[PDB]
């Protein structure tokens, strides 16, 4: 919480987002931030037959 | 011959009412079998008509090329392709009471 306050981030990442297609603000705030994602070896190029 | 140009059969797969399909026979499996036999007959007739039409528009080319371009033949083939599938036509006939069926074992 202290770090987000220092960074100018809403607490718990709860911020109001906007739809990219219509531009209307969503009715409720959404949890936004940075997550670390991995790419696994179960890739579609090896599984389609 | 069926008027393939003005047929009411759906072009793609559609959610049909099972109760209407099996109302006449009381058994969906018997109706499906009758519809498939009529579909085989319809497919044979359609293939014969398409073959006759293509033979009418067939052009004799002596070129050894692997690819040929006959615009009229392509147009006729496209018109036949856009028609509903034979089984869809058979289902439409079955719904409209245009199929005659008889069980030989039951009438023997």
């Amino acid at each position: 919480n202290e770090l987000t306050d220092k960074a100018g981030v809403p607490r718990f990442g709860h911020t109001y987002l906007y739809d990219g297609g219509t531009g209307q603000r969503f009715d409720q705030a959404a949890t936004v931030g940075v997550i670390y994602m991995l790419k696994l070896g179960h890739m579609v190029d090896d599984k389609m037959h | 011959m069926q008027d393939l140009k003005n047929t009411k059969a759906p072009v793609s797969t559609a959610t049909l009412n099972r109760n209407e399909f099996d109302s006449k026979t009381g058994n969906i499996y018997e109706a499906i079998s009758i519809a498939s036999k009529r579909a085989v007959q319809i497919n044979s007739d359609i293939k014969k008509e398409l073959l006759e039409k293509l033979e009418e528009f067939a052009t004799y080319s002596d070129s050894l090329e692997e690819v040929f371009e006959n615009k009229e033949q392509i147009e006729v083939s496209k018109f036949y392709e856009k028609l509903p599938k034979p089984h869809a036509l058979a289902v439409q006939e079955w719904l409209e009471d245009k199929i005659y069926y008889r069980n030989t074992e039951k009438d023997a």
Partner: protein
């Protein structure tokens, strides 16, 4: 089926040339396949097939990519989620099967 439509259209006189055209993924192949898909459902199966709903018939549509698109309402019947699951595609051939 695409081969049949190629010979009917007169583009190719032999099955070999039709196969060559199909392998090259020409736009005419997609134009024919769009019509061929209509009225010819495929069967989707996920192992294990615990009940008969484990095999269902769907009307295919051409899409981009290499993944099969499933309707969300069939997931409960198939017990299929989108965390890496795979499904087998079976193609009926005869009019009785269709």
């Amino acid at each position: 089926f695409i081969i049949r439509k190629l010979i009917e259209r007169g583009i190719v006189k032999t099955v070999k040339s039709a196969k060559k055209i199909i392998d090259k993924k020409e736009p005419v192949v997609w134009d024919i396949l769009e019509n061929v898909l209509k009225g010819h459902p495929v069967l989707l199966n996920r192992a294990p097939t615990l009940h008969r709903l484990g095999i269902q018939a769907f009307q295919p549509k051409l899409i981009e990519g290499k993944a099969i698109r499933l309707h969300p309402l069939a997931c409960t019947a198939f017990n299929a989620d989108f965390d890496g699951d795979q499904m087998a595609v079976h193609l009926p051939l005869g009019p009785e099967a269709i």
